[PDB]
Amino acid sequence: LDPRLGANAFLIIRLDRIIEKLRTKLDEAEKIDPEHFVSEIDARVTKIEGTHCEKRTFQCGGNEQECISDLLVCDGHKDCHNAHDEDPDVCDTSVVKAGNVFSGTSTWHGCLAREDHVTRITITASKRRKFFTARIWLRALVESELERHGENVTSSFNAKGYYNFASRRLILLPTDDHDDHLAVVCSFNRGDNERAECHRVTEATLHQCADLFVTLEEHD
Amino acid sequence: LDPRLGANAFLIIRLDRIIEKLRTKLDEAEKIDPEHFVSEIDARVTKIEGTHCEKRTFQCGGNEQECISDLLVCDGHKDCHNAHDEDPDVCDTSVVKAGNVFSGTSTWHGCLAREDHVTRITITASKRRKFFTARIWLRALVESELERHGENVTSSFNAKGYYNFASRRLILLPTDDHDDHLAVVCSFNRGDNERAECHRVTEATLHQCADLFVTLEEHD
Amino acid sequence: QSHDEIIDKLIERTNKITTSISHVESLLDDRLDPKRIRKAGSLRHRVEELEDPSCDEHEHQCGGDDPQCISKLFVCDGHNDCRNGEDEKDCTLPTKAGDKFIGDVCFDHCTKRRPEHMTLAFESSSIAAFFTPIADLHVHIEIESETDEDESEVSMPADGEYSFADHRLTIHPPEEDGLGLVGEFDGYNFDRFVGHIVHELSEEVCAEFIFHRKK
Amino acid sequence: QSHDEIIDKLIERTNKITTSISHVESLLDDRLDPKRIRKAGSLRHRVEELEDPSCDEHEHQCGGDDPQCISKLFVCDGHNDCRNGEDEKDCTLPTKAGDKFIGDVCFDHCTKRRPEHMTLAFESSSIAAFFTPIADLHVHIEIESETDEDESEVSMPADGEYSFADHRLTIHPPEEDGLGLVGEFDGYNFDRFVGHIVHELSEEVCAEFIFHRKK
Amino acid sequence: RFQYLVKNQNLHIDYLAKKLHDIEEEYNKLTHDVDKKTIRQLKARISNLEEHHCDEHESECRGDVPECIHDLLFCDGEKDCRDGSDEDPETCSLNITHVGSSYTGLATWTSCEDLNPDHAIVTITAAHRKSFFPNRVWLRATLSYELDEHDHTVSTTQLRGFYNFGKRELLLAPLKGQSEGYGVICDFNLGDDDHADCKIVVPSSLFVCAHFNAQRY
Amino acid sequence: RFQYLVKNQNLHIDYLAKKLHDIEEEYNKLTHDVDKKTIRQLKARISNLEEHHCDEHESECRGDVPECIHDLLFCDGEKDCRDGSDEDPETCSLNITHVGSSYTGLATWTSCEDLNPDHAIVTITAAHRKSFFPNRVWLRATLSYELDEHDHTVSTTQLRGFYNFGKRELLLAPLKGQSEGYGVICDFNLGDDDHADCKIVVPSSLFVCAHFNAQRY
Ligand SMILES: [Ca+2]
Ligand SMILES: [Ca+2]
Ligand SMILES: [Ca+2]
Ligand SMILES: [Ca+2]
Ligand SMILES: [Ca+2]
Ligand SMILES: [Ca+2]
Ligand SMILES: [Ca+2]
Ligand SMILES: [Ca+2]
Ligand SMILES: [Zn+2]
Ligand SMILES: [Zn+2]
Question: CATH class for domain D53-215?
């Protein structure tokens, strides 16, 4: 029956284009993530509401609310009633895994006559004292592709610092590079471990010289 | 290019019939097994040459030839210089695994006016004393589909006995079935665990009443 | 059973998959459902309003995972001023000629009629070819009043513009009583906007109406 | 690169498999190689000869994994007498009209010429339609002798039969000296058979020649 | 000779099935949609930071128009809100004041007792709604909070009070004559009927003795 | 529009590839062919049980015709067998009498020493073939067999003798004057040049003191 079978093909060829176009949609779908977006708003709002704990303290589960000193933030011993201060997701070492690279635009408004340029924070190394887990000590490389007299230049420096789970803060100070570089400071308050809000500051006053919103670079 | 591509098919359709016919050959090939046949001859001949060990003794590896009492045949302790008396393949419990069924024709020439009928030895159970491995004790069911006055009848009986690795002998005696049945005796001298040479005999003299060549029935 | 049953098996199977296919194409469309997008984006806005201003007083935020402030005078002007492009990819005029919006009062401390409703008809709308950031409008504000001593109807006409800069249409005072309308759009909605009636000079809010696009 | 390179890739791949296919078809044929079969089966025979007789004096063994003895008078008779069928599936006559066999001496204690060789030409062969178990033959036994006092040649003719029962052709005594030939075939070969020259009456062996089919 | 075109067609299909499974698979490895009960909580949390015109003793209609009506008018049987939002079921749900209802959280005291964060449990013991005055669902409950985390002693004061539909607030005080304990205020402005922002107060001045964010069960 | 017929053709093929792999696979799960060195050993073992006409001091040609020629005639340079099998390399292989050659097995004594089965090792120490008398490869070797399986003492007697091409037998005896130990006879009638049926004898009467089936290395 050459017709019903040779035509049942023009039917299949369709599914071929369909299945293909369908691939494109699954690609569009991965970009619009809900459970992620919602998290951005949660964090975005919690930032306004503000943890009900004093500076340097960790707020626990929205049900059994209670304050914990970040010296226990994530130390290995159940300190909160809900143990939220040891919940894996709070202490994902991956946020600042050695090799992670964060880029973004650094808009200056405080201590330098710089044109909106880009900064590239990249974690060099990361130790975690087995007898004091509450902190991830780390070294990193800060580069700044900015334009000066003439063409494209690169003002970079090596940094040392730490990551605090409690506040998801990453502090990077210059490795005594006597060239006077502004310590960078990032907070990963955005609902994920991919994006962070940073500022260049004076190690002393912590005065904010510039705003820098970084994003973790894709490895593909 | 409708021709070179639409014709490159009459080329593929060929491989389809080929690959299929090839399946049939792989089926014919499984029936003519060499490494198996050779083994049949080895055993067939060794049977003529005869183990150089006295009755009730186990001959070891053709290189470090030496005799061992079958009370050690396969007891768990290295008794032969080549340890051939513990070589896994010698003590494959599977030869007489419970559930194995052996059938074949029983030609009578000694103690019964029976017409060439078939016997069906099927292993019921099989214990193996953990403190005396040299023997597999077992129960089995012997059936004999033979024709008598009129139509097809079945003369069966329950048996108890043992399997001896050393001689690959399987002895099955009647479970005191006071109906006077001839104990069956099989030797798996054929190079494999599938076929065996049997004889019906009087438990006393072990005089041979009949010849019976069994084969393990396929489970498919 | 041969050229009959083996042909209707390579068919009832073609469909058995054509289903599993469109089945997914659905689950996908469900996560791209534009109606869900705006609805959520709309929520985002409400939040953006609570957060400290992202950019200076007279600047437009381009959003994204890497923010950039550009002058509001650049939003929808024809030039790509923002790295990401926001300043140019969303330039659709909501209140365009022919459209009608019905406002439901909810706080009225100034209108002369303290009306229950208030229709907003858009007569004409034209954009200057060289200044895309602002679209000029001509609108008739209709009103159905009714007291004991009488029963009036009104259709005051007024000029106004819509700034893509901040999705805010300003309708110049209709009557010489210094009262004008200022409705700022959601950003993602466009079928509902809060309409504040204010004193042009002062910029005092004294009447809020929720306007819905009469569809 | 499109309708050119994507068409010569769905071709150079069709062959890249057509090879792997016939490659196996070879490895298979290698294990079914009939020449290997007979050669091995032939070996089996040699052994069967050393083992105690499988069946009585005048009975034919059907072999297989389940043996059965039937009368030699039944082998190749037309009736299926053996369960397995052996008694009827291998009934090909080796020494058939036209065929020639060359024998190489190796032990001669009786022939009148104690010859180096001995050709065996088969003139005619006919099987009785009702008794298939035996094929009757007419053969010329040629001989090339050569002494000091003379140089003789001989071509003695003799009757004989071939019994499928045991692949043994018996050639009745040619000369009235009570000497006949008895060659028993391998079972699987048929291109070489040991030829014993015996005294018909006694059945005494007194001359062995290895006969090869002159091909 | 006949299946020469079919034997492969079924293959082209057995194909699609895989190219699709390898999709439906890459799908599941993607975050699912969020329970509407979550979005609801956001719209709530958010709506709570936004500016609100209703003056004390007034709450806004749940409609699309944020009109303000007096608390004494919700769920009284007469459409008081422009749209009637003050009377639709989603507003007058008794879901909260149901007998046996219980809300708990971790009470962290800031003003009236040594006690270190402990578990607080305000649970409803009985509640009737006078036929002619629906605005209020008069009720009785119990407030219990752990004393000694070790020997597990626990205080249990009986309470009286009502539930305000408008403010969506539970207001309980001690029964008067039982060691004069505490009271408790719980706002269910959290979006649904199972989460609330409770605060243990001192009956007299409604002054916050301690605070605990509660959940229901 | 174009690949609509190709996208599947490559599939019909990607198909065959599998239906074949699932074959080549089911193939390997099948016993391989037997090394020719095995068949050889069978044809040997067998050929040894078959009846043989050659009378003592004679061995049969390796040809197709089992002709018998005197031992003193193999490998002497003159075609003595009907076909010349007594002179082809496969017969006159020195493979066995190569210096350093060593054969061992497990000697199980049946007549001249307490000793319980122990390891026997007859190894060739030197061997020359007189240019004018090829029939024999005169040689010297050593026979060693373990004494005390525990402290590993071991007897080592030096031997003299030859190798008979005909009988394919190694015949060694003690050198005369060294504790008068034993001799040894090894038949390599086992099919190849590496397996033999050795028997430790008493030089004097060639009487079997013990027997050991040997292998080479
Ligand atoms: Ca801790
Ligand atoms: Ca043992
Ligand atoms: Ca622009
Ligand atoms: Ca027959
Ligand atoms: Ca009401
Ligand atoms: Ca305290
Ligand atoms: Ca010679
Ligand atoms: Ca002994
Ligand atoms: Zn820098
Ligand atoms: Zn029976």
Answer: mainly beta
